[PDB]
Design a binder for this molecule. Structure first.
Ligand SMILES: *C(=O)N1C[C@H](NOS(=O)(=O)O)CC[C@H]1C(=O)NNC(=O)[C@@H]1CCNC1
Length: 268
């Protein structure tokens, strides 16, 4: 017999009703193939969370272009947009592509993300990279800061929890990238500084986590995705996305952490 997905799903429905919105979750246990799934194929805004995949796209390009990660990007003052705390420090020198990538992933730096998008041929170039690894759901259409609008019913700048999880697995654990690039992506995710109150909060401190967060700041829209390495057994990949119908509906980190915990405890 197969899993009773109603019983797996029920606690997410209670959680999202207290939240006043929708919660989407997909988790995969790479040891057993077990999954947990709730609204996993619905679209949610990416917000900042695209920046993880952006860094992966940069790493893929570095496989065709030796030394890409070493290349300095020397930008002018109009690259600077708010929530760019790392790129704002280096206006007088520039930053390398590696530094920009680290900042985009680990501080969610907005200007760094735009600078890397430009290197890859814009939002369409990142979307094309995702299509190359078989993700037909992901779409990035706009740039920082407009991509955060999170308007209900807008398909722009969205993906699904399942597609995010599947793509994250391919890139971090599968062989979609060469091993050095794969480990770099993992190391950048592991060094994230913005995720302590989201998926990380549901994971024992003994276990390594790499993640990328997103917070659109409107329509209850926020998210996190992660790889979790429990000691001595197969890693877990998961994504938790939220949205809500009213512009002034609050996002909640506690709800993301709670949904992560329900997903992790429900596997296998
Ligand atoms: C990503 O979603 N953003 C970058 C910053 N870090 O948050 S997080 O670690 O990724 O969760 C800040 C949140 C957000 C972002 O860019 N916020 N800025 C806005 O969305 C602008 C104000 C309202 N619309 C544009």
């Amino acid at each position: 017999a197969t899993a009773l997905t109603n019983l797996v799903a029920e606690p997410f429905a209670k959680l999202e009703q207290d939240f006043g919105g929708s919660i989407g979750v997909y988790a995969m246990d790479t040891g057993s193939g077990a999954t947990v799934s709730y609204r996993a194929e619905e679209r949610f805004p990416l917000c900042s969370s695209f920046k993880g995949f952006l860094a992966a796209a940069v790493l893929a390009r570095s496989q065709q272009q030796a030394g890409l990660l070493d290349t300095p990007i020397r930008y002018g003052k109009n690259a600077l947009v708010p929530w760019s705390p790392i790129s704002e420090k280096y206006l007088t020198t520039g930053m390398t592509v590696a530094e920009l990538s680290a900042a985009a992933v680990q501080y969610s730096d907005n200007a760094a993300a735009n600078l890397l998008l430009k290197e890859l041929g814009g939002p369409a170039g990142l979307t094309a990279f995702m299509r190359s690894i078989g993700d037909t759901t992901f779409r990035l259409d706009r740039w920082e800061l407009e991509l955060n609008s999170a308007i209900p019913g807008d398909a722009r700048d969205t993906s699904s929890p399942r597609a995010v999880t599947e793509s994250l697995q391919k890139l971090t654990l599968g062989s979609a990238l060469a091993a050095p690039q794969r480990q770099q992506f993992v190391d950048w995710l592991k060094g994230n500084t913005t995720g302590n109150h989201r998926i990380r909060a549901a994971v024992p401190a003994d276990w390594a986590v790499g993640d990328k967060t997103g917070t659109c700041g409107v329509y209850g829209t926020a998210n996190d995705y992660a790889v979790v390495w429990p000691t001595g057994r197969a890693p877990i990949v998961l994504a938790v996305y939220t949205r809500a119908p009213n512009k002034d509906d609050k996002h909640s980190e506690a709800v993301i952490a709670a949904a992560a915990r329900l997903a992790l405890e429900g596997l296998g």
